[PDB]
Amino acid sequence: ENLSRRLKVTGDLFDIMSGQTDVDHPLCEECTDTLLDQLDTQLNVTENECQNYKRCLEILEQMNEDDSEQLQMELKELALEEERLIQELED
Amino acid sequence: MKLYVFLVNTGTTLTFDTELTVQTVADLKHAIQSKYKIAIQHQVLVVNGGECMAADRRVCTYSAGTDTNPIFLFNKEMILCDRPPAIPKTTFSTENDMEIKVEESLMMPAVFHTVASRTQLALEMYEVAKKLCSFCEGLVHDEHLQHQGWAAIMANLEDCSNSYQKLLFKFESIYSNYLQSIEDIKLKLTHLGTAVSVMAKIPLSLLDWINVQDRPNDVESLVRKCFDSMSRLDPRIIRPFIAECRQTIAKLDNQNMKAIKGLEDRLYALDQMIASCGRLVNEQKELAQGFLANQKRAENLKDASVLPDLCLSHANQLMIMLQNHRKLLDIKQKCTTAKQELANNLHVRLKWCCFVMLHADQDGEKLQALLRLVIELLERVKIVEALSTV
Amino acid sequence: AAYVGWQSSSILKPLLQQGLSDAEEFVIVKALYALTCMCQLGLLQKPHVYEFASDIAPFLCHPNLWIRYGAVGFITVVARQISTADVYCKLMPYLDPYITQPIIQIERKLVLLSVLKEPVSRSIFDYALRSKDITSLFRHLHMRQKKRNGS
Amino acid sequence: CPLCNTTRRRIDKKERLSRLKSKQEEFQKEVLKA
C-alpha cells in the first residue's frame, strides 16, 4: 500500500529531483525529508562515479611518461642496430 | 508517398517504395533485409527524438520516413562487430567509364573535321558530369542523413538512459532514505526473531485469509528472504553498486562523441563543395551549349566567318573543360571514400555507447533485481509485519 | 554473445569459469580468443573484467606460444573494450607481473608481449605438474615465496 | 501533504552534487588525456 505512496513519492521526488516540480510542495513535511534524502542519493551517485574516476587517476602512473624519453635514446640506437643486423643478415 | 529511410547505423541512403509504406511493421525490416543489404536478427531502427518503432504502430505515428524526415536504421551486428561501416561501393562501371573517357579526352588531340564527334562526346561528358554531380549531391544529403541518424542515436541514447536512470536512481535514492528506514528494518528484524518465536509458540475469518497468504510464503522461505535481503542489502552492496551504476551512466556519457567537431560546421563545407560541383556541371552544360552554337557558327562560317582554327579551338576547349571536370571528379571520389571514413569515425562513438548499453544492460538486470529487493523490503515490511503479529 | 548475452553475459561468466575448467591448452588459446571476443561483446565485464585482469596477471608469462600470443591479443582487445584509465589501474598493476618494460602499444599484442617478461618454462612446471602431491608441495612453494617476501 | 499524501506526522545539496559532478567531468577529461 504505502509502497506506491513511497514509490510515487520516489518517482515524483526524482521527477522533481530531475527538476520537474514546483517549489511549493517542497514545504511538505514528506517533501523536505526526500529533498535532503534525494539530494543525498544524488551526491551519492556523483561519488559513485568520482571515486572510481579518481582511483585510476593516480593509477595512471607517469612511469610510461618516464618511458616516453626512453624512445629518444632507444629509437636512433635501435635504428642503427637494426641496420647493422640487416647488413649482417644480407652478408 | 514512398517510404524514405536512411540506415542511421550507416546514415546512408537506402529508401523504401510506397509499396512497403502500408505493409506490416516487419515489412520495413524485411525490406531492409532484401532490398538493402541489412538482415533482420542483427539490426535496429528507432524514432529520433522518439521511441524505437514497435511491432504495430505506423511510421507517421511518430511522423517520419520522409526524404527530409525519414526513419533511422541500425544494424545490430554493425556495432556488434567492429565493422567500421563498410563502403564496398557498388561497381564503379559508371565511374570507371567516366575515368576512361576523361583520360581519352585529355589524350584526345585537337579535332580537324572531327568536330561533330567531339561535340557528341562533350555533350555525353556534360550529361554524365551532371548525373555525377547529382549523385554526389545525394551523397552529401546522405551525409547530412548520417548526421540525422546520429541525432537519432543520441536521442535513443538519451531515452534508454532516462529509462535506466529512472529505475536505478529510483531504487538507489529510495535506499538513501532507507538508511534510517534500514534502522527501522533492523528493529523489524528484531521483531522478526520475536515473530519466529511466536510462531514456534503458535503452531497451526480474516485469519483464514492471513493463513492462505502464509501458504506461498513459507516460514523458512521468509527467513531466508530476510537474511538475503540484509546480506545483499549490505549498504556497500549499493554504494559500490552505486559507483557501478554511475559508471554505467558515464559509459553512456561520452560527451565528446556527440560534439565531434560541430558536425554542422563540416557539413556546411560539404554542402558548399556540392554547390561548387553543381556549378561545375552547369558550366559544363553551358560549354556544351556553346559547342552546339559553335557547330552552327562553323556551318555558317563558309562565307562570313572565314577566320581559321575554329575546330582546333573547339577541341582544345572541350579537352580543357574535360580536365577541369575530371579534377572535381577527384574530390568526388575522395568524398566517396570519406563516406566510409566518417562512417568508421562514428562507429567508434557508436560502439562506445553500445558497450555502455550492454554493460548497463547487465546493470539493468541488476536494477530489476534492486526493484524486486526494495519492493520485497517495503511490501514485506507491511504484510509480513501483519503475518508475524500472529 | 552477439545477440543473447546483454544480461546473461554473467550467465556466461559461469560459463567463463567452466571454460577455465576446460581440458585443452589449445582450448585455452581458444579461451583467450573468446575472451577478447566477449570483451567486444561484453555486458558482464566490470566484475569479470577485473577478475580476468588479475587472473592473467600471473598467467602473464604463460609458456604456451599459442596461449601467450592469444593472451596478448585478448589483452589488446580488452584494452580497447574497457580502455580508459581503467586499463592502467585494473591491469597495468596486473600487467606489471609480466612487462619487463612499459614499452608496448597495448592496442597491440606483439609489442605488449615484448614488454612482458619471457614466458617461463612450462616444461619445468609440467614435470612439476606431472607429479601428484604437489598440492602440499604447492603450500611449500607458497611458504618459499613468503621466504622471498616475508620471514 | 500533497507531496506527502499521509497523516500529518509533523536544493543546495543538488548544487553540491553538481560541483562534485563538475570535478568528475574534469577527471574524465584527465582520463581521456591519459
Curated annotation (Swiss-Prot), chain A:
Segments carrying motif BH3: 1-18
Impact reported for D24A: Abolishes in vitro cleavage by CASP8
Annotated region described as Interaction with BCL2 and BCL2L1 isoform Bcl-X(L), given as residue ranges: 3-50
Outcome reported for the amino acid change (mutating D40E): Abolishes in vitro cleavage by CASP3
Residues where Phosphothreonine is found: T10
Cellular location(s): Cytoplasm; Golgi apparatus, trans-Golgi network membrane; Endosome membrane; Endoplasmic reticulum membrane
Tissue: Ubiquitous.
Any further remark recorded for this protein: Expanded poly-Gln tracts inhibit ATXN3-BECN1 interaction, decrease BECN1 levels and impair starvation-induced autophagy.
Quaternary structure (record): A homodimeric form is proposed to exist; this metastable form readily transits to ATG14- or UVRAG-containing complexes with BECN1:UVRAG being more stable than BECN1:ATG14. Component of the PI3K (PI3KC3/PI3K-III/class III phosphatidylinositol 3-kinase) complex the core of which is composed of the catalytic subunit PIK3C3, the regulatory subunit PIK3R4 and BECN1 associating with additional regulatory/auxiliary subunits to form alternative complex forms.
Membership in a protein family: Belongs to the beclin family.
Recorded domain comment: The coiled coil domain can form antiparallel homodimers and mediates dimerization with the coiled coil domains of ATG14 or UVRAG involved in the formation of PI3K complexes.
Name used for this protein in its record: Beclin-1
Complete-protein stretch covered: 110 to 200 of 450
Curated annotation (Swiss-Prot), chain B:
Compartments, as annotated in UniProt: Nucleus; Cytoplasm; Cytoplasm, Cytosol; Preautophagosomal structure
Tissues in which the protein is found: Expression levels correlated closely with those of RB1 in cancer cell lines as well as in various normal human tissues. Abundantly expressed in human musculoskeletal and cultured osteosarcoma cells.
Domain notes: The FFAT motif is involved in the interaction with MOSPD2, VAPA and VAPB and its phosphorylation regulates these interactions.
Further remarks about this protein from its record: Probably involved in the tumorigenesis of breast cancer. RB1CC1 is frequently mutated in breast cancer and shows characteristics of a classical tumor suppressor gene.
Assembly, per entry: Part of a complex consisting of ATG13/KIAA0652, ULK1 and RB1CC1. This complex associates with ATG101. Interacts with PTK2/FAK1 and PTK2B/PYK2. Interacts with GABARAP and GABARAPL1. Interacts with ATG16L1; the interaction is required for ULK1 complex-dependent autophagy. Interacts with RNF111, SKI and SMAD7. Interacts with COP1 in the cytoplasm of proliferating cells in response to UV stimulation. Interacts with TP53. Interacts with C9orf72. Interacts with WDR45B. Interacts with ATG13; this interaction is increased in the absence of TMEM39A. Interacts with WIPI2. Interacts with TAX1BP1.
Family of this protein: Belongs to the ATG17 family.
Descriptive protein name: RB1-inducible coiled-coil protein 1
Originating organism: Homo sapiens
Residues of the full protein shown: 1 to 492 of 1594
UniProtKB/Swiss-Prot annotation, chain C:
Tissue: Ubiquitously expressed.
Domain of life: Eukaryota
Bilayer-crossing regions: none
Post-translational modification: Myristoylated. Probably autophosphorylated.
Localization: Late endosome; Cytoplasmic vesicle, Autophagosome; Membrane
Functional description taken from the UniProt entry: Regulatory subunit of the PI3K complex that mediates formation of phosphatidylinositol 3-phosphate; different complex forms are believed to play a role in multiple membrane trafficking pathways: PI3KC3-C1 is involved in initiation of autophagosomes and PI3KC3-C2 in maturation of autophagosomes and endocytosis. Involved in regulation of degradative endocytic trafficking and cytokinesis, probably in the context of PI3KC3-C2.
Subunit (UniProt): Component of the PI3K (PI3KC3/PI3K-III/class III phosphatidylinositol 3-kinase) complex the core of which is composed of the catalytic subunit PIK3C3, the regulatory subunit PIK3R4 and BECN1 associating with additional regulatory/auxiliary subunits to form alternative complex forms. Alternative complex forms containing a fourth regulatory subunit in a mutually exclusive manner are PI3K complex I (PI3KC3-C1) containing ATG14, and PI3K complex II (PI3KC3-C2) containing UVRAG.
Family: Belongs to the protein kinase superfamily. Ser/Thr protein kinase family.
The protein's name: Phosphoinositide 3-kinase regulatory subunit 4
Part of the full-length chain shown: 605 to 755 of 1358
Swiss-Prot record, chain D:
Localization of this protein: Cytoplasm; Endoplasmic reticulum membrane; Preautophagosomal structure membrane; Cytoplasmic vesicle, Autophagosome membrane
Similarity comment: Belongs to the ATG14 family.
Name of the protein in question: Beclin 1-associated autophagy-related key regulator
Self-association state and partner proteins as the record states: Forms homooligomers; homo-oligomerization is essential for the roles in membrane tethering and enhancement of SNARE-mediated fusion. Component of the PI3K (PI3KC3/PI3K-III/class III phosphatidylinositol 3-kinase) complex I (PI3KC3-C1) in which the core composed of the catalytic subunit PIK3C3, the regulatory subunit PIK3R4 and BECN1 is associated with ATG14. PI3KC3-C1 displays a V-shaped architecture with PIK3R4 serving as a bridge between PIK3C3 and the ATG14:BECN1 subcomplex. PI3KC3-C1 can associate with further regulatory subunits. Interacts with PIK3CB.
Domain notes: The coiled-coil domain is required for BECN1- and PIK3C3-binding and for autophagy.
Processing and modification events after translation: Ubiquitinated via 'Lys-6', 'Lys-11' and 'Lys-63'-linked polyubiquitin chains on multiple lysines by MARCHF7, leading to ATG14 aggregation and loss of interaction with STX17.
Region Cysteine repeats, residue ranges: 1-10
Variant or mutagenesis effect after changing C4A: In Atg14L4C4A; fails to localize to the endoplasmic reticulum
